């Protein structure tokens, strides 16, 4: 069988697959309390994708397709097509388009568009509202807010930079809050399943990064529980598991010494031995290593 | 047992981002050069991982530009005082030609500027212009100068960062004339010569044409020229800067393959200082399956011709 094996770049050379930045750390906390269902950076480790994950570094949440003016304001409905500019199929069995942000929040960035027929172009500041009852994704619509000119049947994409709020500190967006991808009273459906440790002592480890912010005093932290080169790469590779449970080591190469252990688990997330909110200090120039597959009951060195 | 074996990621064209701009691919492009030389300072890496240029890892941090910045109380226009991509301090006698992903092409980049207030998390964000031809676009030195849409509110000595979304033209009747993406920037300004470039790269075969991985960046304002041609995809840099596999002679003959039936479209050479050449004349955007791959057959000889495409 193939090998089994992890992408060696540092943690500073890879990104977030839940927002197209950087990874800036590694984060471990106590999260058996509430519910951890991210749909972006999914992936299982013999490559079968999962929720709304797609390849791409930079599609994640971006919006494209064609828009309509809403009379009386400076808002813009956008019937989607495909990241590929194709037809959007809503009966996919998925749980949104592929790259849908997959929480709940106000996100700002850049609304662009070109005219087919003499090559002229466009871009306005705009906010999606994650949350609002216009946000039907799953349908083949999302509203726009802006700030000031769009034509309709031309291509016009949204690009995504950071986050907005606007009361009480830092209470959005909220990272472990899905959004209602059909809208109000709408179940959300063929969703990638919850995660949580199911041995004693044990965390998930996040890869965190920080989101722009672009007015207000918005919670910045984004967690997800894979890389988005570690996506591309199990992709790819589709190499045969031979356990439940992936043993990684991350080796400072300064020293070639080990700095922890963790726990890469088939269905696509880390876990590491700690109790406590931790944020890890890491060599920049450290990287994760595959080194073998074990049982169910394999006790971890404290991380 | 012997050299580890090279190979290239089998993602599709439409699944890899271009190494010049944080975009998809969409096209294969080939024609030749004319009046400009090819001489791009991202998406520049050797097939066994020695980064060049400008070049670095993340596909979302090309064309960044982060830093502290100033205003002036007469003008909507800020300097920024430059850090490098991961807010170390940018040290201008480093032996690279600006800081690591810099733009390489001459144009108007369009997108925000955002900036966190370290005492409290306030967040403030707003549109924002570089234009890499002009006189203040110093990066090598250290600044550039972004114009922004309104009269102010950033503050002095707090993180600030563009995130590059598109781009503009404007000031001329002719439609198209800009960006000019073979034209490089002057990094310290136009009186001084630009350092430690990654080479300009032609056909050095009789009856070859560089093969170009084309994108289309969005357009912002007016009449831009909008093509954007990679020399690698970003994962292909991302690739072999990981498995660093030596290259067993100049050049690696690759198959471009469709998916759905497996058969061979083409063949083409991948140089071993980073890009690729197809046995073609003409300037064509080419008729391509959207799911096609590029898969490694062997290291062949300086002489070798290829099928005509
Ligand atoms: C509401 O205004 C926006 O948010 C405030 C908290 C400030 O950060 C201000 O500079 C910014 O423009
Ligand atoms: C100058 O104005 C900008 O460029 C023009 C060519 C038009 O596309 C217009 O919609 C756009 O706002
Ligand atoms: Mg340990
Ligand atoms: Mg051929």
């Known amino acids: 069988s193939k090998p089994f094996?992890?992408?060696?770049?540092?943690?500073?050379?890879?990104?977030?697959?839940?927002?197209?930045?950087?990874?800036?750390?590694?984060?471990?906390?106590?999260?058996?309390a509430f519910v951890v269902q991210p749909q972006n950076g999914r992936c299982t480790t013999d490559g079968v994708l999962l929720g709304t994950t797609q390849l791409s570094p930079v599609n994640i949440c971006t919006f494209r397709g064609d828009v309509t003016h809403i009379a009386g304001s400076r808002n813009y409905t956008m019937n989607l097509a495909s990241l590929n500019w194709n037809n959007?199929?809503?009966?996919?069995?998925?749980?949104?388009?592929?790259?849908?942000?997959?929480?709940?929040?106000?996100?700002?960035?850049?609304?662009?568009?070109?005219?087919?027929?003499?090559?002229?172009?466009?871009?306005?500041?705009?906010?999606?509202?994650?949350?609002?009852?216009?946000?039907?994704?799953?349908?083949?619509?999302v509203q726009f807010s802006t700030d000031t000119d769009f034509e309709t049947?031309?291509?016009?994409?949204?690009?995504?930079?950071?986050?907005?709020?606007?009361?009480?500190?830092?209470?959005?967006?909220?990272?472990?809050?899905?959004?209602?991808?059909?809208?109000?009273?709408?179940?959300?459906?063929?969703?990638?399943?919850?995660?949580?440790?199911?041995?004693?002592?044990?965390?998930?480890?996040?890869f965190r990064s920080t989101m722009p912010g672009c007015s207000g005093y918005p919670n910045m932290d984004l967690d997800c529980l894979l890389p988005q080169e570690w996506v591309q790469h199990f992709y790819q590779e589709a190499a045969p598991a031979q356990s439940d449970v992936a043993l990684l080591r991350f080796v400072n190469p300064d020293t070639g010494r080990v700095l922890f252990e963790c726990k890469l688990h088939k269905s696509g997330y880390v876990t590491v031995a700690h109790t406590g909110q931790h944020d890890l200090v890491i060599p920049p120039n450290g990287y994760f290593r595959f080194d073998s597959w074990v049982n169910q009951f394999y006790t971890l060195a404290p991380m």
């Open 153 to 206: 049947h031309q291509n016009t994409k949204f690009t995504p930079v950071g986050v907005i709020q606007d009361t009480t500190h830092r209470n959005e967006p909220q990272q472990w809050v899905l959004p209602s991808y059909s809208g109000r009273n709408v179940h959300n459906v063929h969703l990638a399943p919850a995660v949580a440790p199911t041995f004693p002592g044990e965390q998930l480890l996040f």
């Open 88 to 141: 959007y199929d809503p009966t996919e069995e998925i749980p949104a388009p592929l790259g849908t942000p997959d929480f709940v929040g106000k996100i700002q960035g850049l609304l662009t568009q070109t005219t087919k027929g003499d090559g002229s172009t466009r871009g306005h500041k705009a906010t999606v509202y994650t949350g609002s009852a216009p946000f039907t994704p799953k349908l083949g619509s």
């Open 5 to 32: 094996t992890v992408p060696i770049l540092t943690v500073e050379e890879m990104t977030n697959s839940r927002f197209p930045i950087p990874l800036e750390k590694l984060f471990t906390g106590p999260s058996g």
